[PDB]
Structures are given as structure tokens and as C-alpha cells.
Amino acid sequence: TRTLWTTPDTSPNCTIAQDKDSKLTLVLTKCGSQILANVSLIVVAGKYHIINNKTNPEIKSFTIKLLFNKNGVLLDNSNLGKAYWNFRSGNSNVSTAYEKAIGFMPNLVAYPKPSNSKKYARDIVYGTIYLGGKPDQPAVIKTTFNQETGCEYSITFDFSWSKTYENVEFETTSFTFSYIAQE
Amino acid sequence: DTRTLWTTPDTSPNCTIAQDKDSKLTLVLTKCGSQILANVSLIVVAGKYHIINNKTNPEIKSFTIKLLFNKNGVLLDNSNLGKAYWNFRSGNSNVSTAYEKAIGFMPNLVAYPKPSNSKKYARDIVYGTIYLGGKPDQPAVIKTTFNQETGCEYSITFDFSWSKTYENVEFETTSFTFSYIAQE
Amino acid sequence: TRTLWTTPDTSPNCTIAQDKDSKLTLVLTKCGSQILANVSLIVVAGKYHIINNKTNPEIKSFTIKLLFNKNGVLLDNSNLGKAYWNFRSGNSNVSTAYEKAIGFMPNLVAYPKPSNSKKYARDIVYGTIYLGGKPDQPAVIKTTFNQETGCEYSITFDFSWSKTYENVEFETTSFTFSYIAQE
Numbered sequence A, C: 001t002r003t004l005w006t007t008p009d010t011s012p013n014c015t016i017a018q019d020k021d022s023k024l025t026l027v028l029t030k031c032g033s034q035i036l037a038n039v040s041l042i043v044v045a046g047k048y049h050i051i052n053n054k055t056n057p058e059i060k061s062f063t064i065k066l067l068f069n070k071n072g073v074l075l076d077n078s079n080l081g082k083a084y085w086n087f088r089s090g091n092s093n094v095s096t097a098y099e100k101a102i103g104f105m106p107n108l109v110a111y112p113k114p115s116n117s118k119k120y121a122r123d124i125v126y127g128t129i130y131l132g133g134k135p136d137q138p139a140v141i142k143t144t145f146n147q148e149t150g151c152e153y154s155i156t157f158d159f160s161w162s163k164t165y166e167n168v169e170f171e172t173t174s175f176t177f178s179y180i181a182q183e
Numbered sequence B: 001d002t003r004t005l006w007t008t009p010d011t012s013p014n015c016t017i018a019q020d021k022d023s024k025l026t027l028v029l030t031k032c033g034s035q036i037l038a039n040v041s042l043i044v045v046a047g048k049y050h051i052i053n054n055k056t057n058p059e060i061k062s063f064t065i066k067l068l069f070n071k072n073g074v075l076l077d078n079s080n081l082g083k084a085y086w087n088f089r090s091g092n093s094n095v096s097t098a099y100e101k102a103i104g105f106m107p108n109l110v111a112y113p114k115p116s117n118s119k120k121y122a123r124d125i126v127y128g129t130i131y132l133g134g135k136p137d138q139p140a141v142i143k144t145t146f147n148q149e150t151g152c153e154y155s156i157t158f159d160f161s162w163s164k165t166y167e168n169v170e171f172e173t174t175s176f177t178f179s180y181i182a183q184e
Ligand SMILES: CC(=O)N[C@H]1[C@H]([C@H](O)[C@H](O)CO)O[C@@](OC[C@H]2O[C@@H](O)[C@H](O)[C@@H](O)[C@H]2O)(C(=O)O)C[C@@H]1O
Pocket: A128, A135, A136, A137, A138, B127, B129, B141, B163
């Protein structure tokens, strides 16, 4: 079981603002002590489908959280739907929900849960993706590990942009990053 | 399969952008299961794109290098990259002849569909920035697109471009790493 | 044996300007002919701990060097301490110091040592990381392979920034890159 993923089709699997308003494509491949991750996002409807900052100046960011319990299982408060996340089988997923994926969780010593101790920035990775694949439409994808509550582990994607986009569909290029694995 | 498909890493020209063997593309593809970890750099040694001067030629701002593969993952002759040294790695060179299969290194067609009249999504593109001559003030964009060429089953296209006005700058780049979802 | 690392704790292991003034977290995971690297830096004391370019406009960069001999063993003149640079075991290291790691070394034909032959830029990788995890606090991390002398192989991290930061602690987000291995 070396890859946990959302199948790479275009069917909605994530709820940002309203039910199933987006397709998060996330592939986590275990390369031993590091997880190699590849991510992209297609928003298909709702509030974040077409960005028009002339009309809505305040719509400049949104968040997608993946919350996991002690066994690396996705919790239902996550934005990504549970039915859509599992180990890879061909171009699809296994038939039944996995029970353990601790080896794909962000390492708690590298990336500790919030506490009264000093918080370090190494639990964040920043990247830039491009809306519609156009070079002049960058948006930031900030990924943070284990900073959510109500979970043993978490991966949070905070998307934001600073440009004033007018009628730009929120569907992105892909970004790769890695993180240190719990086991 | 943790093998590596590569161009070998010396600097002998192995690619044709504007004229025969005018450049050396160094591309290393390593299979990490469902993802291919890729490392790429480029050295142009002659011809039109060797030395850039956007004051005399402001129109020269981009070029393309295409790798075309057949259904077996074999590089096709009409790719910009020459077939002679694109092969699986054996030490600092290649295995004795020519792989026949490398489908496991090809860009996934569900993730990155060939052109059609269905909506074209941006996820088949990865943008990166590399630097000419290793200088921090000489960025150029390397845009990599998967499976968008025709006359092939799979493809990897590198579109190089720059918006800075370069003056007699040699086009040889730093390296960029990206990954993509593997077909198998 | 597929991972050479600094361990993921925050105990200082690197000397930039003064003894153990920082924790360099570096994980090298061998993915065959390519090494997948993940790096971040936390400076805890000394000259590069708090950056203030109003006060010291001259402090705009520093370097961290890892020098290796023919066997891939870290030389003591590296900025990183030999103490906790070893193959991984859980969240720590193996008890005994390794004696060979040539397969983690940057390839000499791809990245040759300086000579009177033409020097090419492919032995460099540039990335951007963010101080304190703030998006408006970018710094460049430039990594160069095999350009140091007095070693068979080397990996050098050159950090620099161009913005005038005022009392910004140098602790970074993480960055991932890869390089061609010697064997
Ligand atoms: C693919 C990529 O790197 N996109 C860049 C983009 C392109 O370089 C540009 O659109 C190509 O012509 O530039 C972006 O920044 C614009 C910004 O760039 C600074 O260097 C410049 O000083 C500013 O005046 C301004 O041009 C863009 O938003 O278009 C960023 C994007 O990441």
C-alpha cells in the first residue's frame, strides 16, 4: 500500500462552501521516511467556482482540511469526503475503507500539535499554482501539518490570492511537495 | 520498479530545438510507485536559442522541447530529444540497447487526458522557475505539460519562456524537480 | 538505510556563525538514482537568529556546508555536526555512525567539481522559503552540489533575502527538491 489518493478523475469529492463543490486531487506516495505529495484543485460550483473580486472583493481565500485519527483514518469533519480517500488500485481505489495509514501521517515530532511550546514554521510548505494554467493567474497554496484540533494528525490546504481576478475559474495547475512521515 | 529513465548526465548535445544537436536536455525520471519524480535542466550550445539578446530580438522569448512516446513508452524519432541516449540507467550511462517498455514512467492519462473537446483542466501543467547561468536575477519559466501533443500516446512538453529582457545571455539552466502521476 | 537525516527534533545541530546556533532539519531519502531532499532551518541564537536589516543592512545571506569524503561520510569541517547525521531508526538515528553513503552523494558527472572545463548551472537548485511561516517574508534557499573543495562531494545551502526585514526570527518553512545520485 504505497499510495493514498483521491482518484484522479474530475468528480467532486470535497466541500468547501457547499456540498461537493470541488474536486481535490491529492496523491500521497510513501518514499520511506518521506511522503511525496502531488495536489491540484478544481472548484466546480458555488461561492469559489468563479472568482470575481470586482463583485466580491472579500473573497480571497478558503481552506480545505484533512483531519485524521490515531490510525491515520480521515475524520468526517474533513472537507474531503471519506468515500473518496483510500489506497490506489489501478486508476481507482480499493473497494473498502482502509483501517491504518500511520506511515502516511505527518510526523508529530517534526510537526507538533499546538501547545504552549514555541510553534515553528517547519510544519508549513508554501507553493504557487496557476488558475486555468495561465502564467499570470497565480494563487498560493499553503499546506500546514498537524495544526488542527479534534484530531491526532492533519493536513490543511489554505488557498489564497492577492491579485484582483475577474471571472476566473478556480481550477489549478499541480504542485508537488514532500513531508516527513510519522513512521 | 524504482528504476531510472534518463538522458545520461554528461553534456554532449542530445537535442534539437532550432537546429541539429543544438542543445543538451538533462532529464532524469525515477519511479516512486504511483508518482514519477522528475529532475530537469537544459544547456543550449548552438543556434538560435544559444545566446539570447532581447534588445536586438525582443520577439525571441520562448521555445519548446517535446518528448513523444508511443503506447509502450518508447521515445519517438520526431521528438526534439534524440533516441540514442534516452534509456534506463546503468551506472553513468544506459543499459545495452533500448527499453521496449516504460509505460510505468508515462504521465497518467486519466489525470492528464490527451486533447479532446472535453474541458481542458490545468492540472496537466506544472510550472517551475529555473535560472540562467545559475544567476538569481535571471529567471526563466519552465512549463511542463503532460499528454497534450498529438501523434503519440503520451508526451511531456517543456515550454521555456522568460519575461526579462536578456542581453547576450547563454541559455543554460539550473535544475528543477517536479513529479507527476504515473500511468501504471 | 534509505534515509540519511538529522532526526526531526529541534535540538541544535548546526553552526552557522557560532556553536550550535541552529537546527538544520535535512532528510535525504534515496529514491534510486535520485535523492529526494526535505530541508528547513531554525536559527536559535547568534548573528542570524533575529534579522534586522535596518540595524544591519549588510546581513543578507549565510551558508551551510555539508562536505563528504569518498565514502559519503560527513567531514568535521561541515557546518552540520556529525553527531546526529546518520541513517534513521524511528524518530532517531542508528546507534553507530555509518561508514558508507555513496549512494546519497550528488553525482559527479552531473555535478562536477570545479576545473578548467566549462562550468554549467545544473549543479544548482533555487527555492524560496518563508520566515516564521509568513507569506510576505520570503528568503531564497540556493543549493549547490559538489562545488566545495577539500572533499569528494558536497551539498551547500546558501540562504539569502532581499527584503529589509525588521526583527524577523530566521526559522523557515520547509522546502523539497531532488538531485541525481553518484550511484
Ligand atoms: C509562470 C510564472 O512564473 N508566473 C509569474 C508571472 C509571469 O512571470 C509573467 O506573467 C509572464 O509574463 O508573473 C507574476 O508576477 C507579476 C509581477 O512579476 C514581478 O516580477 C514584476 O516585478 C511585477 O511588476 C509583476 O509583473 C504574475 O502575477 O503575472 C507572478 C507569476 O507567478
